Amino acid sequence: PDPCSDENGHPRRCIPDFVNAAFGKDVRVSSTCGRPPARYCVVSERGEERLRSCHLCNASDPKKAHPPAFLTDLNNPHNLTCWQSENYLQFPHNVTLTLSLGKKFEVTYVSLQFCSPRPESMAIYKSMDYGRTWVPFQFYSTQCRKMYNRPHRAPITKQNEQEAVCTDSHTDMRPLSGGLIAFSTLDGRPSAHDFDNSPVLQDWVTATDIRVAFSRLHTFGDENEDDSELARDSYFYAVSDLQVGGRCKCNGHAARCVRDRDDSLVCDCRHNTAGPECDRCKPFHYDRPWQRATAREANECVACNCNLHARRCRFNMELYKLSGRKSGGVCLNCRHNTAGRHCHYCKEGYYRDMGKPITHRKACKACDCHPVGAAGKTCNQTTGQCPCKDGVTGITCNRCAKGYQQSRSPIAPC
Amino acid sequence: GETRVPEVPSSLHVRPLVTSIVVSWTPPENQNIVVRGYAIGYGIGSPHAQTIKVDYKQRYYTIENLDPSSHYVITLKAFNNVGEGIPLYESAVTRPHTVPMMPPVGVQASILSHDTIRITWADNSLPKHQKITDSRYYTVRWKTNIPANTKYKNANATTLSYLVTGLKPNTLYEFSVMVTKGRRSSTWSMTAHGATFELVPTSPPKDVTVVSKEGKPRTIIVNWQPPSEANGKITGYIIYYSTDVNAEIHDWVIEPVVGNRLTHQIQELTLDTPYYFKIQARNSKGMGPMSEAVQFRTPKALGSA
Ligand SMILES: O=S(=O)(O)OC[C@H]1O[C@@](COS(=O)(=O)O)(O[C@H]2O[C@H](COS(=O)(=O)O)[C@@H](OS(=O)(=O)O)[C@H](OS(=O)(=O)O)[C@H]2OS(=O)(=O)O)[C@@H](OS(=O)(=O)O)[C@@H]1OS(=O)(=O)O
Ligand SMILES: *[C@@H]1O[C@H](CO)[C@@H](O)[C@H](O)[C@H]1NC(C)=O
Ligand SMILES: *[C@@H]1O[C@H](CO)[C@@H](O)[C@H](O)[C@H]1NC(C)=O
Ligand SMILES: *[C@@H]1O[C@H](CO)[C@@H](O)[C@H](O)[C@H]1NC(C)=O
Ligand SMILES: *[C@@H]1O[C@H](CO)[C@@H](O)[C@H](O)[C@H]1NC(C)=O
Ligand SMILES: [Ca+2]
């Protein structure tokens, strides 16, 4: 069964399956251990005593390697696979993760599962364009104003709904392993209750790229000591899983996202819509203005009525309002010698053939008015009679009436 | 084979409620990898909040104790002793706690024929004279007034005017209309009476008995019951009699009877003669069909044997 159409065939809103846009994707990271191989340390608390078990990170050996591939691979709780940064890349230095999707996605959540303790300061950004410019999404810090120049736990108002909020909720050093930072886009937003009709939030959830930047590391305090060799080897960022959950942005006009000719992901547009995100109407389907599909009403594009005489059409708002917000389409360059808004009549100097219908190619016949005999170029649309000069008779005005003689003067033919 | 992690399930479906969410699924396509059970990860915004593990036989689960009007993201992982497989993601918003028309006026009966009657009604809800812009449907019922507790015959109509099909002539019918849109429904409208037009009878008169008059043998009394399919008001009856049954209809002696009478006397007849009788009913429209021939021999005279 087709999701974009009903049992009778009438169009209905269709959305692509909820997926993890991050899963199985290449993630560009600023830092990764094992190049050259270096020792790292895992701290395991025994009450007050801080026991430490040190291991080796080696990119060259898959058994000891922690590549950025481990961020989006199958997250198995039994066999955890996590990417690991270089040891002690403390503030102002920051480890950056960059996920690129060549398609607009309405992101609902962004979540990071950690192998090491969660950072003190972490930031999430999004990209509206394909990675060119960045827009802040969500901030996490114990010092919100001093780190990201944003107030701590800011109240989301109807005015600034697209505001990137800073919180201290998932900043805690403990748990030292298995810690999770999950960001829900629509959480706290006032218009969320009616997202389907909220363009402000429809835009907020939209993103092509996701950037996660870990600014500050959580430390016990041994970092600034003389014997800091073992201590600094214990601090790093390690992420077992990265999730970017949401839906392919098709504006409710496509049931699935399909790979295009340029190998990029695009919507399999339905409801006579076109473009990557089904943002526009299919050519010649400009009868009414484009609109995003809602659960109540599917806003399919309507084809211009041209009586099978035009391949191209335009739109006029004034005319659309005149029809009572029903139709505003105007046909362009009517073929088969026709004219009008909908090519509903014959061209100036062509008569309507009453036998054949208006949809047919042979609907209009040429007047064939004589340049000398006839006075005018346009003939009668019903009978086919051309306005002949004084003393001239006939459908084409080529005959002289009984009693009239053909003369040499062009003004008076008979 | 428990060496590999279970594959992604074949399908995932979510149905939302007030404080519940019904998760329904199908097992993974590849039956080669052994599946021990399923993991359901649910939560507001992200599916990380809570996790529920069910057996491999299970194909449905109802997530209880949920907040109303909240967007939930659900995940389904197939798992065994080596780990958890690729999840199927699906999201649903819980329905709110809130759980939920005037009958037509001016119902008039317009009789056209013996089998068809036009029913017209107006609405106070609509601003214009007639407006069909909303998804509303009318239901019309009909029954005979003569029999007690007659079964109602319902028919759904799109427009304000409807023609009733398959009706009996000379019978009073009552009509009721009701407007229906969505879940809410209105009661029946004021009953409008409509009597069907008269028609030519289709059944001959029943229980035809011929018995000779007591004392007078030349005079005979013919008794008959009214026909079942009268199709109108009885205006009269015509009795046909002839000594030969094989004779043409117009050769039989015509005897006219009035509508009120159901018994007639035929005088001046030959004694010891076998007579045949045929009766037909009549109304304002036409002439009904004739009854079967009834043989009756007149009594013998005092003379001879
Ligand atoms: O990280 S280093 O490779 O530079 O080794 C530094 C010290 O770590 C020990 C034990 O100290 S502890 O962790 O505090 O317990 O060895 C441990 O590290 C290596 C590599 O770790 S890894 O997870 O395997 O990647 C392991 O050696 S090996 O498997 O690569 O060959 C040790 O495992 S094993 O003993 O060989 O089986 C591992 O030991 S443990 O299980 O954590 O206890 C020390 O080595 S040890 O004294 O021989 O155990 C290193 O300290 S040392 O003074 O340099 O010897
Ligand atoms: C790193 O891995 C490579 C490949 O297994 C190995 O040759 C090399 O010796 C390793 N380095 C260390 C320090 O173990
Ligand atoms: C298990 O996890 C390790 C890292 O701890 C990884 O190298 C390996 O690829 C994973 N999978 C298997 C099948 O061992
Ligand atoms: C740290 O993050 C900033 C952006 O916040 C970036 O410009 C910079 O290159 C990153 N790395 C370092 C070492 O500053
Ligand atoms: C049509 O009328 C019948 C009467 O029995 C009823 O059961 C049915 O539901 C009606 N159709 C609709 C669409 O309601
Ligand atoms: Ca992983």
Author numbering:
A (entry chain A): 38 to 451
B (entry chain B): 765 to 864, 869 to 1073
Copy the relevant paper text.
Neogenin (NEO1) acts as an attractive guidance receptor when the Netrin-1 (NET1) ligand binds, but it mediates repulsion via repulsive guidance molecule (RGM) ligands. NEO1 is a single-pass transmembrane receptor belonging to the immunoglobulin (Ig) superfamily, composed of 4 N-terminal Ig-like domains, followed by 6 fibronectin type III-like domains, a single transmembrane helix, and an intracellular domain. Secreted netrins comprise an N-terminal laminin (LN) domain followed by three laminin epidermal growth factor-like repeats (LE1-3) and a C-terminal Netrin (NTR) domain. Structural studies on binary NET1-DCC and NET1-NEO1 complexes have identified the three NEO1 membrane-proximal FN domains as the NET1 binding sites (Finci et al., 2014; Xu et al., 2014).
We next determined the crystal structure of the binary complex between NEO1FN456 and NET1ΔNTR. The observed NEO1FN456:NET1ΔNTR interfaces are equivalent to the ternary NEO1-NET1-RGMB complex, with NET1 linking two separate NEO1 molecules via their FN4 and FN5 domains respectively. The NEO1FN56 structural unit is positioned differently when compared to the ternary NEO1-NET1-RGM structure, undergoing a rotation of some 130o around the FN4-5 interdomain linker. Interface-1 and -2 determinants resemble that of our ternary complex and are also observed in a previously reported crystal structure of the chick NET1ΔNTR with NEO1FN45 (Xu et al., 2014). However, we did not observe a 2:2 hetero-tetrameric arrangement as in the chick NET1-NEO1 structure, mediated by an antiparallel NET1 dimer. Crystal packing analysis of our binary NET1-NEO1 complex suggests a continuous NET1-NEO1 arrangement generated by a crystallographic two-fold axis, mediated by NET1-NEO1 interface 1 and 2. This suggests a ligand-induced receptor clustering mechanism, resulting in a similar arrangement to that proposed for the NET1-DCC complex (Xu et al., 2014). To validate the NET1-NEO1 clustering model, we performed AUC analysis of the NEO1FN456-NET1ΔNTR complex. We observed a concentration-dependent shift of the complex towards higher molecular weights (10–15 S), indicative of NET1ΔNTR-induced NEO1 clustering. Our data support a cell surface receptor oligomerization model in which a single NET1 molecule links two NEO1/DCC receptors together, leading to NEO1/DCC clustering in a concentration-dependent manner.
